[PDB]
Each structure stands twice: as C-alpha cells, then as structure tokens.
Symmetry: C2
Subunit: 82 residues, 2 copies
C-alpha cells in the first residue's frame, strides 16, 4: 500500500520568489533552498539564503512525496506517507 | 608606503549576532558570512544565511585591511588601502 494517507509537511520560506528556490527531496531528507541577492553595490553584492532542513524517513518517501510551491516561498510536501 | 589613507568598506548584515558570523578576507575578496537557525520544528529546522561578497583587490589587501564588527551584524573593513 505504501500507507494510504495524505500526508503533508510544510516548508516555509518567509519571502522569496520561486526562481530563487530549489526544492530537494533526497531519500530521508526533505530540504528547501532559497537564495536571493539582497543588495548589489560597488563590487560587493549582498545575498541572503533560506534553507529549511528536514530529516524524516518515516514520513517521507521521495517516490510518493511531492512538492507544491506558492509564490511567496511556501513549499508544501505532500503525498502518501511511509 | 602601501598607500597612506584610511580606507573603509562596510559589510552589512541587517540583523544577526557575532557568534553566527564569520568574516573572511582572502586576498582580493572580502566576504562576510552569517548563518542563523531561524525556527526549529519537529525534525525540521529552518535556517537563514547572509553572505556579502566583495571582490576588491585595489581596495583590499589582507595584510593591512582589518575587520571590526558591531553586535547587529555590521562589519567594517578598515585599514590603509592598496
């Protein structure tokens, strides 16, 4: 069955835009990485990153858990649970 | 002489605490890295990072340029210029 239940974990990035996001699910880890250039100056650029890291194997199987994303940086991982 | 002038470049991290900061000057690059755990949950932790990156060789020589830091994350690189 691979557990019939719709499971959802949410990943939150407070404010970023989807093009500056990378969502990665790798086995037992579900992580979201966002990186944005904040302020560009002289020859100095300033960047900020958001990384949320989860390690959940019992709750996450990469074959059934999928990711949906909102424009603000909210990422939701959903699918049948393990 | 190695140019007698007090030169200052500022590196800004909007809000962080000095223990979550690393300031690095490596030749022609002057960079500040800050990393903070934002929100800790279930088995998911959320982090944010601030990285400011400069590449200035004509303005930065690691032997004379030094770094001073404020508690809010403001880092100032100062010293005689190249």
């Amino acid at each position: 069955r691979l557990e019939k239940d719709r499971f959802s974990v949410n990943l939150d990035v407070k404010h970023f835009s989807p093009e500056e996001l990378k969502v990665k699910v790798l086995g037992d880890v579900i992580e979201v990485h966002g990186k944005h250039e904040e302020r560009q100056d002289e020859h100095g650029f300033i960047s900020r990153e958001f990384h949320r890291k989860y390690r959940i194997p019992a709750d996450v199987d990469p074959l059934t858990i999928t990711s949906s994303l909102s424009s603000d940086g909210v990422l939701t991982v959903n699918g049948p649970r393990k």
